[PDB]
Write an enzyme that holds these catalytic residues in place. Structure first.
Site, PDB file in Angstrom:
ATOM      1  NE  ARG A 152      -3.198   2.836   3.193  1.00  0.00           N
ATOM      2  CZ  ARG A 152      -2.739   2.856   4.285  1.00  0.00           C
ATOM      3  NH1 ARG A 152      -1.472   3.020   4.790  1.00  0.00           N
ATOM      4  NH2 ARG A 152      -3.408   4.360   4.289  1.00  0.00           N
TER       5      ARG A 152
ATOM      6  NE  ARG B  59      -1.614  14.402   6.138  1.00  0.00           N
ATOM      7  CZ  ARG B  59      -1.261  14.125   7.124  1.00  0.00           C
ATOM      8  NH1 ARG B  59      -1.643  14.152   8.246  1.00  0.00           N
ATOM      9  NH2 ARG B  59      -1.893  12.755   6.896  1.00  0.00           N
TER      10      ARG B  59
ATOM     11  CE  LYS C 149      -8.594   4.920   4.527  1.00  0.00           C
ATOM     12  NZ  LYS C 149      -7.325   5.697   3.918  1.00  0.00           N
TER      13      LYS C 149
ATOM     14  CB  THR D 236      -7.945  -0.077  13.796  1.00  0.00           C
ATOM     15  OG1 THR D 236      -7.884  -1.503  14.490  1.00  0.00           O
ATOM     16  CG2 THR D 236      -9.121   0.031  13.177  1.00  0.00           C
TER      17      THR D 236
END
Lengths: 485, 485, 485, 485
Positions: free
Chosen positions: C43, C85, C239, C297
């Site tokens: 990933r 951010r 997701k 998680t």
């Protein structure tokens, strides 16, 4: 699985037995015999006999019951209902007919009928058929066809050559019969016999809807002259005997105290291959509703002229028990059969044998799951008694009851253990004679729980139903587990 | 299914909570707080502290319990058992070590250790290791290797550079530790603290077989000097902490009053991936046997230095409850953590939430099926109570008990209803603080069943556990269903 | 039961493993290691790095995959999505804050921020808060409260004294964030990286409804310039990272090729005790729908700074597998952890261990019953393969597939046997790296069933997956049972 | 549940029907009629008739079968076995007897018997009885008691006055009959009729153990002179007719190709109430083993002299089907009854009706659970075919078979779909006429699977067993699902 464990071997009967009392077993000695062979309930078919015959029979049943203090016998009146019968024949001798001849049928009931002109009980016969209609006599023996209709008669053409007697059945296929379900005679028998002499069951013939049941309820409530103004707790058992009854089953079952599945006209209104399907279905529905169901199709025909039955008849009773039937009923096997005692004894053993094929835990869970929750307190106590008996491997479930309701609820959940119902009211005990697996102890008093249970365990020990060290479940909103002294 | 009904929404807690009491929560005010957050049992870890530290704590617990009369707090003594700890460091300040240096370890326990020569409580240390043996300190922090063995010391080679403090743990992998499960100190703590001050639980560290349990039984039966010759009913809860304990689990479980799954040495003797498998099995076996099981692996590590835990820690507790755990235990989170009150509160809400994921009828049948039949009378009564509670949709199961055994049996079958135990003996109430879903009512007398049930229902009404018209099952060999007035 | 058989012992892993590739494991050697430890899918978190960093990583993954011809590695692009951010700090050095001070936050992103005025990527920040709103930085580290709002800035009051770095997360509780789910950068990454370089999965961050999925479908269908006009079969994995996604789960799951359950904002919008409930529910729903589900998680937090994890982290992965998860994902354990190789290896062993706790026949019947009938032919063949494998005790289920659909359908029914998927298309094999229990053999041709099966059994024998005399189920609308030569 | 869906209504027959061919239905026209009413198998009872009688019948059956090319008729030889029959009476006219008279019985079989001295086929009769032994004739008609024993005769005392004819049955209760299970005549009939004329079934009378079955196996293997040295595949169907057969059932069932439950002597050796228990067990064991079972107790006795049967007789057939019976057999109803064609037609409709009471998924899981795993390849294929038929809701299961074994295996699992067996060997089709729910297509070649299935589907379409677009499962170690063109 359970059936195979039985084969390796090749506990008293739970299914109750109803016997029809007639000429062949009308005396005290014979009735005592019937009790010894397994009779739970004596049935009086009010299609036959007269007031004096019925009354004598009743006295004999009760005298015979007195001779058997460890037994309880219920008494059932089965109504004549909306039936059509033929009249008396030539002087008194039976008559045969040949196809082609024209047979007359008068509505003048009080007339001796020959080979040419017979009688009929149904005075509305002429206004119920049409030219071309078929008239059946003795349940498909004398088949005829209407040629003429008069004021008080019909003329038919004999289609098939057969032999028939007096007072024979009559049927009108595709025709509406204008008779009440509870006529004037039925009312008379209900009030002046069943209520008057304090009988336990009314088997209501040819019930077709809930309104038929409600009429009978009303009659009971309006006729308390024989019981000091106190409404009888006599139980209504509706007989499903035709298509209408089958269609309206749910309503009838819901209104009634019990159901009887009987021969009636059903075999003429639907295909015969479908009859067993309807029976199985009605039995299951009665099981789920917790209403007692009686199977009664004259299962042992061959035992009117033979010492023992054939396989087909035994398997019929076995499979009726396995379908979930509470009682089985004998008709002409005891009433006017050559071997009344043999039949009952055979039927009893078959029941006991069929009951060994039952997977009790599985049966319990099936019924428990089918019942919508929450339930009332009494029903919850009943379930827990059955579960408890299983969990400790008890031999008996003893219930102290004043109405029999808890005993009926325990019976609904089909315990492997025999159910012993303790009551101070003999009527309650007789009422319970149609509930599967229920044995009754009648007591002077029911107030002291401890004493009642002690006597019941002592009496049950004497009757070889329980031993010392064995567990029993005692129920009276309350449940306990006791040990047999 | 049950988990997804909860997602659409996005009943008190049943799982009991054990809190370890240390410096961070020693005072009355803190302990009152812990009760309000959900503490059922206060644990004293006798691996730390002295007589006066433990005695003060015991008083504070008991004073705090008096400030919450509707609650019941159990008190658990966790034995030191066979452990090896280092001595005190340079004056009193911690010391770090670097790999390559030669560290000495003396068996003279009464000595201040520097960065070169530390101390040790295990006097048979020299006779337990050989040249090349690995000596672990602080559970895999200071890995060393033996270079020399003297009469009362060993010289090791520091393998990995790590920092450690005082009184730290010590392990000898692959070496037999010649220490008893219950030594002089353990006997002293059991007799002169647990028995003397009437505690409720002995958490027995490093139980390895049934014989260890039976030794503790023996101590208890041989020491009745503080209870007038009547043996204490203090519960033995065996801690499974190593491979031996796992191997002999069945024996231990059968001998014990309960089981605790702890961290111990297990993670050093078996692959770490296998630990959760062992835990799940041990919990299932306890459920089947009806013995309380405590899950306690320091589930909320992060809450010693943080306001709230991370996902993994909460799921761990949640799955422990779903695995069948009777109690969850907090360790360093309450004892010397920075956020004790937040931890307990979190763990409580997780437990309640996990409990809403349970299919109660399915769980009941799973446990009922796993229990070999026949059972004894009280176990049958417990089963029937749970089934009856379901069938009438009761809110409470109330049990009148002198020992707590029936309340434990009901607990075993995992009813959805809260279980109310009514007793006259406060020790019985405290003992039940490890049974899941049990709340306890202490009464002056337990003699008059009707009165006991009336007051229990009134007190439950007051506490908002039941309302008027609601059903409750009452159990005292006997079972009944009552309506709350 | 199954868990206890495992304890008595105290078959390759079925659950797939996704590893996030970052600085700690970006080189070929490390990536090979990750494959050896159990990595199924690599990933790339597009929240981090630049075009050159991503491209190099991709080359390294593929080079590492070439060094492992008996392995198939899928590649996943995880979109940045609608995140906020902070900017770059003083020169490049981290900064701490103290409660009480007034911190300014400008929307001028290309600005170096000190201890008084930091930067923000979200230019609509001033129009998204109000006086009194709370602004969270680094997922609940720097908690502030708005004091002033300007044209291109806000002034907040630091509520709690904490330490934070650069590029940290930002949250606006109770405020609507005006960012697209697929912004301009996300589109660029999807088209110019995932499609351009032929990646296998797009992990779509913060999906909130089916329309988000459909936008991504549309983008894929309108961008075929890199594949000769042929629409990519790249898989969309949505997701669920917030409350909206949970509310609209069914729609999202129904639209997507798979689901990922990730940390996101969920832990701030609902009570934390409820998170595990939502995860369990989403996993079950994916199992019933036969859509692959990824649990992620950051299960092994402690393994960024430690050789091995704690119990809570291992049980989390174990219970995720037992909940029915198809894949587990490592985040910062591999990406920027100190011990990337240790974590994967631990996680892999845990998965294998958890899979021994599964009652396979029971799991099969649960899924089979949950699926509405009739099904399509391919799904029926899949079920029969799983039933057949059980009935003959087969060791493998081999499927010849051109799309992977039959392999996905077999996976849905959770066979105990390993599923071997044979295809001629390498893309199909990579796509299957998120399906539980699927191993793939890539072939030159797939036309000769007999030959394909022979080679597959020979290769599987070589890999110690099957032995001579063992049965295998071969599937290709057709099913057969063959014996391994 | 399933029975009640049928009550609201108030698919071809699966249960096979065996008709006994005698004088009443010997001619071609009659046999054509019997095929149309539902005859699957024609039974020749070799206890009656001669060579020429049997040979003519065999030709008529085969000529009638040619007139119905879409049907397949199996031919069964039922052996005389060890029976005792009387001789011929006074000239040729029947004789009645009165109790008290002394009846003589000679062993000179070639003699005309009067009302004083009858004849007997059992030559060892004098050496088998003693003084006081009871000799029954015509199955409990003529009960006698031995008074004297001579060299070739016995003198008895008639106990009960009854009427009997010629060739009547004879029983010696409690006496060992020294006759082989397969004597000279039986061997002759098996070799020079069943094998010589290529029949399909040997119904082996009075099988008592496995050794009896193995003797018949031996005869078959030692007599290939009529089939070019290739052993016949004629099926051995053992008749359980006495207590010994019941005791050794497992051995017999395992050795045999099938089981017939017949009347025999059983009703004289065990209590009559136990017969149905034995039958239910024997049927269940056959179902579990996958061996065909025939129920044959002369179910429709009343239809020898009546147009239609009574309830008990129909329920008997219905419950036989529900017990799990593969075939039902008619005896005297077709052989020498007055209404053969009505009987078969009734029995056929009952079977079909009883089959609508079956819960097919429940039945499938019951059988599947009862079969110990692992099974062999073809049994797994059969299971999967039944499950796939269900899951896609197919109308047919088609099996290409050279032996019929797969069709029998599918039949065992009781699919709701009709099973179509495609074979090139007409004997295989005839053999399958005792497997429930199997229809057979005989083809010139079976080599090209695709073609076989195409023609089977086209022929099934023609016969209205399937429609276009409908699914069918095709089985030939291999299974597939096809759509009907």
């Amino acid at each position: 699985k359970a059936t195979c464990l039985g084969m390796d071997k090749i506990t008293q009967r739970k299914t109750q037995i109803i016997c029809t009392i007639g000429p062949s077993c009308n005396n005290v000695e014979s009735l005592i015999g019937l009790i010894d062979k397994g009779m739970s309930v004596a049935r009086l078919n009010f299609s036959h006999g007269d007031h004096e015959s019925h009354f004598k029979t009743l006295q004999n049943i009760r005298e015979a019951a007195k001779a058997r203090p460890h037994s309880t016998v219920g008494i059932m009146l089965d109504t004549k209902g909306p039936e059509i019968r033929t009249g008396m024949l030539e002087g008194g001798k039976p008559i045969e007919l040949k196809a082609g001849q024209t047979l007359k049928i008068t509505t003048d009931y009080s007339m001796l009928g020959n080979s040419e002109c017979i009688s009929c009980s149904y005075s509305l016969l002429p206004k119920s058929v049409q030219i071309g209609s078929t008239v059946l006599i003795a349940d498909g023996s004398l088949s005829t066809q209407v040629l003429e209709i008069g004021d008080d008669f019909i003329v038919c053409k004999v289609l098939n050559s057969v032999t028939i007697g007096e007072r024979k059945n009559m049927n009108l296929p595709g025709c509406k019969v204008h008779l009440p379900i509870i006529g004037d005679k039925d009312r008379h028998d209900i009030v002046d016999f069943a209520l008057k002499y304090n009988l336990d069951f009314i088997a209501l013939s040819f019930v077709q809807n809930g309104a038929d049941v409600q009429l009978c309820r009303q009659i009971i409530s309006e006729n308390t002259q024989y019981s000091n103004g106190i409404p009888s707790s006599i139980k209504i058992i509706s007989k499903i005997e035709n298509l209408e009854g089958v269609i309206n089953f749910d309503s009838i079952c819901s209104e009634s105290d019990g159901i009887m599945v009987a021969r009636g006209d059903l075999g003429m209104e639907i295909p015969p291959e479908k009859i067993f399907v309807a029976q199985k279905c009605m039995i299951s529905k009665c099981n789920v509703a917790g209403k007692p169901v009686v199977t009664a199709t004259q299962m042992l025909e061959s035992m009117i002229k033979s010492n023992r039955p054939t396989r087909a008849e035994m398997t019929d009773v076995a499979n009726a028990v396995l379908d979930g039937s509470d009682c089985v009923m004998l008709s002409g096997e005891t009433a006017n059969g050559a071997f009344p005692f043999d039949a009952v004894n055979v039927m009893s053993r078959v029941c006991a044998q069929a009951e060994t094929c039952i997977d009790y835990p599985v049966l319990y869970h099936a019924i428990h799951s089918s019942v919508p929750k929450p339930v009332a307190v009494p029903e919850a106590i009943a379930c827990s008694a059955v579960e408890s008996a299983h969990d400790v491997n008890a031999k008996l479930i003893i219930t102290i009851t004043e109405t029999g309701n808890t005993a009926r609820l325990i019976s609904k959940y089909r315990p492997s253990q025999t159910i012993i119902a303790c009551t101070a009211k003999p009527e309650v005990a007789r009422g319970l004679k149609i509930a599967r697996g229920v044995k009754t102890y009648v007591l002077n008093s029911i107030h002291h729980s401890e004493v009642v249970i002690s006597n019941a365990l002592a009496l049950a020990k004497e009757e070889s139903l329980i031993e010392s060290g064995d567990f029993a479940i005692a129920v009276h909103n309350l449940m306990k587990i006791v040990r047999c002294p």
